[PDB]
Structure formats: structure tokens, C-alpha cells
Amino acid sequence: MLPDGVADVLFEDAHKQEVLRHQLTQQLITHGYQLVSPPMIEFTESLLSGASEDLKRQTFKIIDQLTGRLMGIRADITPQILRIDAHHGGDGIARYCYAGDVIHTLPSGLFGSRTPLQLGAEIFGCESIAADIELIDVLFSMINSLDMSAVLHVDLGHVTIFKRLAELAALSASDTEQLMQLYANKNLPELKQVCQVLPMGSDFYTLARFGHDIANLLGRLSENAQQDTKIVTAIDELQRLKAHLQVQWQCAVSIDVTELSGYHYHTGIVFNGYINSETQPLVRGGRFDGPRQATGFSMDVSRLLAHTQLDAPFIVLIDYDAFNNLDSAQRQLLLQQVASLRQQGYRVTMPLTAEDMPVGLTHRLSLADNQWRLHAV
Amino acid sequence: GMLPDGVADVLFEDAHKQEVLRHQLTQQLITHGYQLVSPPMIEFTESLLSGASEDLKRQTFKIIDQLTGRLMGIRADITPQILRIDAHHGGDGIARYCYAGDVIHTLPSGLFGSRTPLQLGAEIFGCESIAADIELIDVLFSMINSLDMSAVLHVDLGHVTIFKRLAELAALSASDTEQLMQLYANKNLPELKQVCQVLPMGSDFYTLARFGHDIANLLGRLSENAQTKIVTAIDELQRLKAHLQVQWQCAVSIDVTELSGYHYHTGIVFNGYINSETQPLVRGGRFDPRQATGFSMDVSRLLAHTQLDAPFIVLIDYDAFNNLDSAQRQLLLQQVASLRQQGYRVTMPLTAEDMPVGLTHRLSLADNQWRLHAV
Amino acid sequence: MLPDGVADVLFEDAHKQEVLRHQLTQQLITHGYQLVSPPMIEFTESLLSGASEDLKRQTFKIIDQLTGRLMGIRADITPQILRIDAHHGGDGIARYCYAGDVIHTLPSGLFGSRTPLQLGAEIFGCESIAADIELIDVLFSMINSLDMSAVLHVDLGHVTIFKRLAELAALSASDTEQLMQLYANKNLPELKQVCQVLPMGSDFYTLARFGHDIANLLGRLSENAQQDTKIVTAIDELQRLKAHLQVQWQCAVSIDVTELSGYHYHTGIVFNGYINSETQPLVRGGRFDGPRQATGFSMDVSRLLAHTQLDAPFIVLIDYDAFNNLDSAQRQLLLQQVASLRQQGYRVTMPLTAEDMPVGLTHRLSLADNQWRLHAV
């Protein structure tokens, strides 16, 4: 009955989603990220400014009946944070967090969602790798708070590396697109072939062959490459984050400098967190562009639902008959008691009729020797 | 004005406040025993706009599922989605639901109205008794009272059953009713008395608009033919009027010519107005062989009239932090961790100039002890 | 009952419109312009490629339900001719004509139409002023065929002139926009003021003050200006067309080199024809851009309706009674006769009933001494 990649989230899953959304949102706020809550729709002029072709295609279109102009139902909040920071951010450092629904026209992955609950954070106005470390800390505080048996595996990349080789090797638009597609498919055999002809082609093969080993990667590259500062800084950045994740958070990190998804928008380091053996990364972060520095991540909160569990809830019913036998003053006392229970987080239903039964009923609040008490069913 | 009309960012402290309200109110409802449900932003129109009025259909943006070529809609009201959920999972007994979620409208509701409200509401299915409507009234007013507003909610009751039974027992033309309704909506009384002089039972239809507000005597002013479902309706209205005055000390007004949602409302209606604002803050009523009743509100409209405690926004000293060795940093982080749990907003500075907005305190080092001091 | 700038065209006006549309269309075809009939709607990608901001705002938007993409109801056909010539035109000279309805969101002029019947011609692939002369000839053949008492007055301009002064005077985006707005409003006093400070400002004042006199305009300009070939060619072009219109067509021409409507799309000469004392030009032509040369004009055919008149029509009714009294063979003969009349263009109605009466009835076809004959009412 519902479109593909569109699902109800109901009852305890819905409560769990509320809890996660709220806890994670507040965690970010306490780390000093300003919460911002942009709208579901904007005019396309603002919504899809600087937008990729994949983003434009993912964004449903609708017509503002008041102006006859084109609007869109957002597919990513990240551009909205750019807009907000353009207006209110100033030249200094600015921090933002956000949680909100976004809509996609098509699923990303096999049976993937089209109505994800996008939650994320961002730091603008800092060039230093220290900002990327902050977000890594903020992120991992969040993940650790969830008490998952699920294991997050993290993959680092750096699009700058391949960008500087392609520039220093004077690569044709088509050649790059070939290299990129080969990398994406990890065709090493055919990569070694196409590189034997291409200028610096040793270097492009070394990326795919010895990328994972970030310690020694720079030593394996050409003199022209090793001279260049943008390649050398990129390899340092990658090494710093690799360490910090292992040391400070005890994270299993792998390097892949051939990871060039978002070659257009990523202006450097990239982060991809995978939960257990799932194909779509749970978390996607990286360096991008506001002439304003910017970096940050996002996640679909709804995908945490499978790998998180709340304590079982206490769902309490008051006895209809016993309640109605009480006099005014006894009712007051019971209500004051039931009020107290609700504050403690108990789910107490005041029955309208004898048959009124809450779903998942765990306890009854019943009268016994002039005392109201909880007993299991 | 870079955003469409009735579309606004909610930012920074207002955004934090909105999160807090949304969460507190949602949990309040959960603790009153309403099951939270979170239906999606989009459905196929078949399901989304089943039994939908013409106003609802027009308010609901349309989009195309590229995978099936079918029509979908970006919801403008969650209430129908709760019907669908209760149809599948509700069963024959009593069921309670709450929800909070964004909805989109094609056009503003009235004067300067929002088109992207944050719709929060509750509903009770499977109870015919007026006692279910009293529960929701109590649940609602507990929620409102928890907000510590200086703002005063004024409440308006109506009952679409009354005008439905007159129109049926006067055998009314589709056009006639639509005229009466438009006149009522405008309270154009002179022209109403005119159009009623020709229409059958038209005395009765004019008495509704003229002596509706006086619910005590309303039945006595109607025709002999009028004086079953009409008789219950005036009693219902009188019971709720009382309950609101007594139990909550609420200023109630009656208006039986309130017929917004003539299509979906199968009886009593509720409209709460905050201070002197035109759009009601709260909209509830009886709807629908399964009984149903409940309300909703735009959480975002509470923002003006609600106020959180001032926040503690803490900055660690850049220099002092960097002078620490590994082990001292761990201890400071454990301390800062503790502060964050207490709800303090602590920023770890990337540079000497890194300054949080609204800075209330500094966490500074003195004789090997970190402490908070105000600026 | 109808939106502003939206009107029925009915009965004889409608017949007149059909006639004009057809005659003018065929005239163009016989001058060797290929007729092309592009659709009312396209995807915006194609429809508004290279579009101005005024064009984008004039173009209603709608959603393709089959793809969820944005489409538009065209407001000008000229871009569609570009598209057609891009695909089918080749490197050589190509000629196109077109007549079709276009829709505007807002009127151009006071109580102006929003549903004009846009008719026009275009020549691509010729740099020479000879192509602009052809269109002038084609146009004036068309206008002369209409037998109007109405007088077409023509205004020539050249945006190249002001473009070269602004370039050779190194003008700031704002300065130009001031000059342009002043020109548009013919504020000469304030123009002479703002020019006393601006570089080459003598030249910009000479445009507004002595533009109308194209014979001597070049002699009044600075040495820097007179040296430049693009200004000198522009003044020659203007002089050639001025003459050709007076000589070959006996046209009242005025020059206005400060006419810079369409500064963005016009890449040179411009043409504006005004019918009697109407403010909106009836015809708008000029040099523009396909690296492909292009030039051409258009007109709203519907605006010719007021200033054109067809011969009164013969609206004929056969007598009901007399017809039915005839036998099979007599009916055949009458039908063969009525067939002949229709070919001659007579409007003959075969009555269904005695009361059947055509509107504007001019004649009856009646039986008299065994002869069917026409008689006026």
C-alpha cells in the first residue's frame, strides 16, 4: 500500500526514533553546535544553488500557487545549512546541527529508503584538520552513547590526492572518467593496462594498488608527486585522522584514496562509516565548500533503529471499577500518584470503560488493603 | 523574502525551543497512554486522500512515483494516516495514538498563515462516549498548562450534526447548503435572514446563526419537527462547555455555525485560539463503522508564547587547554563530559579567536583547577 | 469572464485572422523560408536555454507527470528556431518561418495581450548586411499585401555602437545601467551632467543628442571612436538600411542608436516597426546569435486585425421548402451548383428546418421559372 522505500515507523520503533533523534540532537547542542531547523520546501533558486546533477534529479518539484514559481521538496539539508551560514555565519567559526526529514525521488541502494530522517553537524570557517577531529569526536560520542552491539567500520579517503595527480599529469576529461570508473569497479588488471600508456600512470596505479597503506604511500609515488605540497599535506591529514580514530576511539580504520564519490562537491578528506556489513554507509562526512571553509557529516537516524534497543516500557492500566468506587479526595491522591509515575516515564492509561485495554499491557495499578500498587499481568 | 510565503527557517534558540516543546509534549502524550506513530511524509494518493474533502485534496501537493508512474502526495494532514494505521493495527477495542511531524500545504490557511506547520496531535478511536472527548480535553489542557504561558487559550465549541440534521430534514439542495455555509462562514446575517425566508425550515437555519452562542436555550428556539440527533448534540455541547469552565476554568464560546471540515467532522468540533490570533492554535473534533475523535496543533506557533531557561554556553580557554599534557586533557574532558550531561553547552575551541554565540561562562585553569566563571 | 489580455477572436475577425495567418505564412514560404511548427510545450532545459530573465519570468511552468520534470508553455518561438537550426541547419545559410500561439504570464503594455499569435522569419549563417536587407524586403512585401490605410513607421538602432563606446571607455556595470536608464527616459539634462565626469562622456551625450542624424553621427564622435572599426561598420550598416527602406519601399525611417531594449540578446542592428501611434511595436527584428550568425523578426498577427479588412462575405441560404419539393435528379443539379458556389468562396448553408437561419445572411438561393438564382434579402 505504500510506495517503495516508504514505510510507517510505528509504536515502539516510533518511540525509539523519537528518543534517538532527541538524544543525538541534544548531544550536538551540548558540544556547541547551533540547532537550525530549515523548512521542507524552498524555491529551487535557493534550494538547488550549486547543486549536483544527482541532487537535482533526487529533488521532487512542485509549483508555488501564489507566485507560479518552481519549488522543491528537499532531498538534502546540507545546502540549507550553507544558505543559513551565508546569512548568519560571519567570517569566524560557526557550528550547526540539524535533524529533519528529507525526500528522494529514487532509492540510493537496493530497497533503500526514500524518506530518510537526516541528522548531521557541520563546522564552517576553519581550515585546520582540528575541525575534522572535532566532528570525529562529536560523532563518536554520539555513536558510543547508543550502546550498540553493531560495529561501525570507518573508511577514509582524500579526493585532493587524485585531483593533484590528474592536474600534474594533465589529464583529459575522458581519461579521468575512465580512471574513476575503473577505481569504482576495482579493475586493477585493466588499470595497470591503461596506466602503461598514460602520463604519470605509475602513480595512478600505485593509488589503487598501495592506497590502503597510507604510511608508505608517499614513498611509492613519483618525484613530481612527492615534491607537490597539496599531495603531501593530504597524506599527512589522512595519517593524522587514521591515528586519532584508532587511539582516541579504538576504531577500525581503512584507507581508500580511490574513493571518489562526490568528486564534484568534496574538496578534500572524506569519511564513510559502515554499520556491520551494510552497503550504504551509515555516516557520510567530508571537506566541502561554503571563499568559505566547511566540513561535516550526516546520517539517516532511521537506520540506527535496527541496531539500537531501549529498555522495555512499563505500560500501566488503572482498574476502572476500583477507580470509580473512590471518592473525590481518594481520586486526587491516586491522580497525584499517577502523575508521579508518568514523570518517572511510566505509561499510565486512565480507562474510559471496563474493557479499555492498552496495547502491550505490562502492569495493573490496583487497590489492595487501602494501598494502590503495581502488579504484573 | 528569499523563501516562499508561509515558509520560514526556525533557527538557533527558537529551533532548540521547538525541539524541546515537540519532545516534552510528545512524551506527555506517551505517558497518558497514547501510542506514538510516525507515518511517512509521502504516500500514494489512493491511501493518502481516501475519504478526503475537497479542501484537503487542494491543500495536498502532488508528485510522481518514478518507479510506478503513479500519483503520490506530500501530506497536508496526518489525521488520515492515523485512520489508516488504526484500520490495520487498531482492532475493535479502544486505541490511542499521538504523533508529531511536518506537513505541507499548497496555500496558507488564513491571514499570513504558515504552509509548513509542525503538526502535533492525539486521537482516541473506539469509544462512542463523551468521556473520550473529555479525556482529550484533559490531556490537551495538561499539555498547555505545562508550557508556563502568559498567553491565554480561548476555546470555541461547535457541532456539525445540528446543521446536518436540519439540512436532511429540510431536504436541502447541494447549492443551498453551500450558500448557507458560505453565509455562516462570513456571518452575513442580513443576507442570511433573506435567503432563509425562501428556503424550507429557514427559520431554523437563521436561529442557528442568530442564537447559536446561547446553547442553554438553543433547542427551545427551534421548530417542533427539529425538537433526535439534534437533541443529543445540544446536550453534548452543554456538557463540554461546563467541564471546561469547572475543571479547567476556561472561557468557552459556542458557535454551531462553525462548519470547517463539514466533510470529515461527524459531530462535535473544538477550536482553541491563542490570545487575539485569527488561526486557531488547536483544532479538534469527532470524525470516523469505527468511532474516532482527537485534535492537533502547530507546535511552531507555541514558540512566541513559550520561554526556556537561559542556557549556559561555556568556552574552554584555548591556551590553557593546549598547555595540558595527555593525562590532564583526559581529566578535563571527563570534567567537560560531566558538564554536558548536566546540559551545559561546552565548546572546544579550534583557535584562540573561536567564540561561541551567547557566551555565558568560561572554563579556565587556576592553580591546577578548572572552574567556571561568568564573563 | 476571461483573464486580462485574453480574448476570444470570433466570427469575421476569426476568419480574417485565419486569412492573414495563412497568406503571410505562404508569402514567407514562397520567399524560400522553410516553415517549422514547434510544439507549445517543452522541457525547460531546452525551452529556456540561453533565456533572459524577462523571458524566464514570462514563461508559465508546468510539470510533466510522466517524468516529474519541469516543462514550460512557450512565451516566444525564437529559441525553438535556434534549437531546430542547431539540429538541422548545418554550416550554410538556413531560412525559417513560423506562426504559432505563445503565452505570457504578464502583459507587455497597458491592456496588452497575453496570448499573441506570433509570426516571424529568420536567416541564419550569413554575416552580410544583405541578409538583413532580404528580411526587410520579405517583411515589406508582407505588409504591402495587407492593403492597410495604417502607416507603419520604422525605427532603426544599433546596440553595437553603445557597446563599443562602453568598452573603449571602460564602463562600470552600474554606470552603463545609469546611462541606459537615462537614455530610456530621454533625460538629456541629467545625461549631459553625468557625462561631464565620465570618460569619453562627450560621446555618450552625442549619441542621445545627435543620434537621429546618422549621416553626420560619426563626424561628431571622438578620434578614439572614429578609429575603431566596429563603430564605423555599425554606422555604415545603419546608413545602408535607412536608405534601402526609403528608396526601395518608400518608408519613413528614424534612427535611434540609444534604443537598447534587449541589450543582452541583440548582437547588433535592431528594427522596430510601429503601426500608427501605438506604443508597442507591431514588428520587432534584429541581429542576434546562434558560433552561428542569425537575424530575423516577428509580429503578433492578431494586432493586424484592427488595421486590415476583408471583402464582405456572401452568406447564402437555400430555401428549405423549394429544396424538398425537388426530385433526386434536381437535387443532384442543385448540389453541383452549390458545390461550385462554395469553391468560389460563397458560404452556403443547407437548411435542416424551415427556421434554420445563417447569421449575417446576405442572399437566398431560390427557385424561379425553373432556375436557381441568388437574390439579396
Add this chain to the structure above:
Amino acid sequence: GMLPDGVADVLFEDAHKQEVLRHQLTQQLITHGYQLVSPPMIEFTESLLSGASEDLKRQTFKIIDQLTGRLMGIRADITPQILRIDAHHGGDGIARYCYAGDVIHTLPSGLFGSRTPLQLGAEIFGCESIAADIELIDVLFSMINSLDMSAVLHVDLGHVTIFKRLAELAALSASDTEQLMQLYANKNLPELKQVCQVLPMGSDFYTLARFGHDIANLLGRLSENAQTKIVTAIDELQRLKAHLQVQWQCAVSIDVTELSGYHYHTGIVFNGYINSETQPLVRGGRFDPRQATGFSMDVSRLLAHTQLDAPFIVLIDYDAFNNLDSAQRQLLLQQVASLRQQGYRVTMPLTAEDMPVGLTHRLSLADNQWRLHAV
């Protein structure tokens, strides 16, 4: 595929052909005494979609009048506009109208159908008699015969009155009819016989689908209750069937279960199919206390099956022209002017290389005489 589906350029000779057809057919209608009217592409929806079916409403693109904030539509059918025109200017007597104009559809009509047809049609108002339907049939077939097509028009008659009277005299549910109609549209006979075994008079409703094609005996197969408006309807159908066979030698088929336009058709319907194509080329019928009847066609669909004479595309010699003096040029232009009036397509070359497409002749100078010769 750079253009939306069901949207195509019509270019060059096809475009010339379309102009010619549109014009010839339009004038044919004018000479038969139909007043030409040219209503606009857009109206306010109030006027455009008054009395409109649900299929018509869905086919009609919506847009916003920025001057009034109101809803307008880009027409999908001109037929309603002719109603409006006749309401204002028609009077009580007989009125005839013809029209040709572009219309836009949101979705294709059927398999690979156009969304930007060039709708041409005629209509007669104010005549109850079957004689008006015969006139239009004659007018139509004169038009088709003038086209010199090898293509064969096959015609299908129906009558919505029949099924309307059964549904009324069986007291049918809104849903039931919609089921019957969908079944009929699909000619799912097995399932039709099933659903009829339960439905009232359902024998009759099955006999429509099963023995509709046999109009001679159709009435004899219906119930006693069925055997007034139903009786005229079968006669009407029989009269037109004959007239088409006799007067035009037309292959006619009957199908009384053709109920496209159940909302607007108040009786007889006409559907002409060209060769083996699925979408009818021509669509006519009785509609609507003012009588009305008429047809329409997409002129663009005639393009495949119609052929104009080859054109004479003439080029003047560049060199020879330029060698002339002023006075000789005048004489040549007067000669070329004459040729253009005769319908020749004469191009005045801008350069030596200037070559018209489809060049048939050259106009060349020889011993002080210009003449035409083929290439």
C-alpha cells in the same frame, strides 16, 4: 528524445502540409456555413472546466494568473469553449461553428498518443433532429474525401443513452456502474457475465456487451421493462448505420458499450479509425436546455496519410543577378514576384554558395532572357 513524450516538432514539408490541411479543411467548413471561432489557449478554470468530466479536469494543465491570484488552465479540448461562445452569442435558433487550434494534454490519450494535438472540428447547436447528425456526417466525409487518401476510415457508432436508461431503471450504485463500465472498456466478457448474475437486470447489461454489434436485433434481446428513450436510441443508431453505408459506402460497426465521455455525451457517439490505428482519428457525439452535436480531429494525424504535390523550389543565379543594373533588377523582381504568386518558392541568394533545400529549378540568364530549367 530531447522533447517530452507525445511532443514532437512538425518541420519543413510536413509543417507546410499541416498548414495546407488546416487551412483547406477550415475553409471547407466555412463554405458549408459553419462560423469560424478562435477562442484563446487559456481561461480561468471557472469558465474552462464548467461541467467538465473528471478525465477532462485531469487532462487540463493548471497555471496561476499573477494579476488576480486565480486558477487558469491551458485547454485540453475546445468543445467546451464553443459551448461558452454559443451561450453568449448563439441565441435560441440553430447555430453552426467550426474551429482549429492547438490543445494540450497532461497525459497521452492512449498507446504512444500525442499530448499537443491540433484540434479541428465542427458543431451544430439548436437542432434535436437526427438530420443535424447527418449533416455533420456529410460535412465530415466531404472533408475526408477531399484529402485523396489511400487510407481507409472505419467508423464505430455507440449510444450512451441505452446504458444510461438501464442503469436508471435498475437503480444502480455509483460503484456498480463504474465496475460495469471498466469491464465494458476492457470487454472482459467472462467476468461481466459473473458480475451481472448478481446485479439487477444484469441479463440486460450482459446482452449489451454480448449482442451490441447486432443493432438490428438488439432491442428484441432486452427485457420487457426495457422494450422509451432506449427504443429511440436503437432506431437512431440504425438510421445512421444505413446513411453511412448508402450515401458514403462506409464500413460501420456498432458498439453500445463505448462509454468514453459518459459524463458529457448525452446520446449518440461516433468514432472514426484510420487504417489499423488504435486512437480514433475522429471523435464526435451528441452533448448539451440547449441541443448540441459535433466532432473533432487531430489534424496532425492526417499528415502520414496525405500528400501534397511536389513543390517547385527555385534559385536565382547569384552572379547573373549581380551583373544586372537597377532597371534590369526591377524587371527580374517583377518576374520573380509573378512566380511567387503562382506558388513557386524562389530564393534570392545572398552568396554564390546559397543553396535552397530540395532545389528543383534554376532561374538563369541567357541572351537577355530569364528562364526556368531543372537541375
Add this chain to the structure above:
Amino acid sequence: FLGLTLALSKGRILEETMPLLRAAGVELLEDPEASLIFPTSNPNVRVLILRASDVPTYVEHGAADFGVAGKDVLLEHGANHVYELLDLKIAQCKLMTAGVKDAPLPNRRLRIATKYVNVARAYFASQGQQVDVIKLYGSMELAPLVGLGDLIVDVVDTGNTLRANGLEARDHICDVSSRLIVNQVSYKRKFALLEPILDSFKNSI
């Protein structure tokens, strides 16, 4: 201010309502015309004096709780977001089409120049006549005489102003009298304060 605020038009309306106001226990303390907010003998009522075309705007937005304004303004402005409780039968006139004296309507499409743009479009729509409407804020008698419009739409009681400017009434659109309008919220919230005043006025009529 927790009592009622009353929206009123200077001059003709104020003067013709004061007898209803005095009878409802509402007397203004100063004379408005003698040199913006005014008290009254009832301390829970006050009065705002504005242009007659702004009364519905102040009432619908609730910056006044209730008001008196001519049906000409309500029709033109649209009374969507207010309640029209009482026809006060005061300040009476009519909306009419007007043209130059004895001159016939011209051949071409009609140009109407008027304040009452929506009234004009609505009326001439009801008479099946297609027109061009021209918005005027100032007095409209001049417009026909310099052919800005062919006709005008204006209020007329006697037609002296019309004849004095060489014009004459042509068609009767509808009757006009000032009406009592009430903000929709104010009618629910402050009915207790309104009921007496409404009853007085209603009695007075």
C-alpha cells in the same frame, strides 16, 4: 486594553451612528473633527477614527474588535475574515455606473475607471460585458471628461455631484448602507461586552 475597540470613519458615518452609540451608553468625550484614539463614557469602549476603506482592514486583523463601514467598502475589500452582524440603515447611497451627459457608449471595448475595481469587474461580468478596468484612488468624476475611462463606478445619493461635473447615472449595481462588522475572534472572546451594544443598536433600528 482589554475592552472593545470600535473602528469608525470620520464625518458622515460618525455623525449618523452617534444616536445609536448614545443609546448604547457610548458617548465620545471630545468631538473627533475638532483635531486618533478616543475614549468614551463607557471605559471599556474606545474609538479609532480612520479612512472608511481601512475599517475592514483594522477589524479583520483585530486591531479593532468591531467597526462600521459602508457595504461599498466591504464588497470592494472583501469581507472574508469578518462577521457582518447588522445593517444599520444609515449613510445610504448606491453603487452605480456613470458616464458623460447623454453621450452613448462607444463602439470599442469599455474602459471603466474606478476606486471600486473588484465591484466593477464583478458587475460587468454579471452583465456579460468584457471591460478594461483602471484603478483610481482620487475622485473619479474627471476620468470620463478626459477620456481616461468611458464610464465610472462611484457612490451616488442624489446625483448633484454627478450633474455638477457634467455626468449622469446609468446603471444600478446595488444599494449601499453602512454595516456593523465584528472581528471573528473578538465575537467569541468578548461577546459579553458586545451583546448589550448589539442589542441597543438592534433596538434603535
Add this chain to the structure above:
Amino acid sequence: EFLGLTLALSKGRILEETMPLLRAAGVELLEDKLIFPTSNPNVRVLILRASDVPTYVEHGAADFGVAGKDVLLEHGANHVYELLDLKIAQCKLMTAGVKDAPLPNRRLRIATKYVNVARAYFASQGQQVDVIKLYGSMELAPLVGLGDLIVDVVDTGNTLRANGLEARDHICDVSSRLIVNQVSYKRKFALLEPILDSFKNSIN
């Protein structure tokens, strides 16, 4: 019938401040009656509301006129020519609010005559607003919270202070301008050229 120029004028502040330019151009009004003669028989004057001047001029029921740039900006001067800034009847379009009151938490409501000016300005300052149309005097609107701010013309500020208000932002400067109907500028230039030259002279 009348073949000379018709001049559109606003009664009060404009008429008074233009008469020195008019007298200098050989145009003296005979009286101080809807249409008015002048000493020049080929000129006449229409007195109308200042917001109607552009309407009468663009439609050609007057050949030319004087109206404030506040009206031209609000009305749109698309179909007229703005020939001369007359540097008379000067003022400014400004946003105005109540004395010392801060801007409220919620979205700003502006109440004003100058609706399009307001939307255009607050658009340029990237601020989203609710605009409320007033025909009458706007000083009252803040005081009964119809709007938070207003847009109005102000020379000195005395009317603003006298109603407990104060200027907040400077939108743009204002002075009455000379506007000419587009046709009238082509057809009757011979009659206009002297008058334009006089005015231009009397400016400096």
C-alpha cells in the same frame, strides 16, 4: 478636440512648489473646477490625487505630469518617460516604528500605502515580512499593533514624533519628477521642448 498639452498635477505641496517653474515657462494658472486653463492657451492643468498622476499620464489622458518618486516607485513607471528630476517637494521613504520599542521575536508585519516599496526594500535587506495595505494615514497602525513598522514619507519627523513614532531605516530619497506620456513625447515634442528647457533652466 484639445490639441495642446494637458498637465497632470497634485493639489497642495506639488502645485505650490512647481508654480515658479511654471511661471518661468510662461504658464500661470487662471484660478485656484476640475480642469484649469493657463496663460498659455495650448496648456491646461488637471488637479488629481498624487497617486493618480502616473495613471492619467501612462494612459495619455494627460500628456505629462509631476509626481513624487515615492508614487513612481510604488506604482511602477514602466509606461512613462521620467525626463527631469525637479528637486522640489523633497522627502524620504523610511521605515518607522514606536518610540524605543524593540523588534518583536516573530516575523515583521509592515502596514503601509507603499506595499511594493516595502516588499522590494525588505527583500533587499534579506528580511521576510507580512505587508498590510493601508489607504489612510499610517501613524495609527503601530499603536494598535496592526503592524510593527510602517513605510511613509517624512521630511522633518514631526508628524512621526507627534504620534509617538520614530524613523528606523532610510529606504531612499524622494523628489517630484517630470513624467511624459510616451506617445505625447513623439507627437507633441514641439510644444514640450520650450517648457522642458524653462524647467531645466529654473533647476539651475
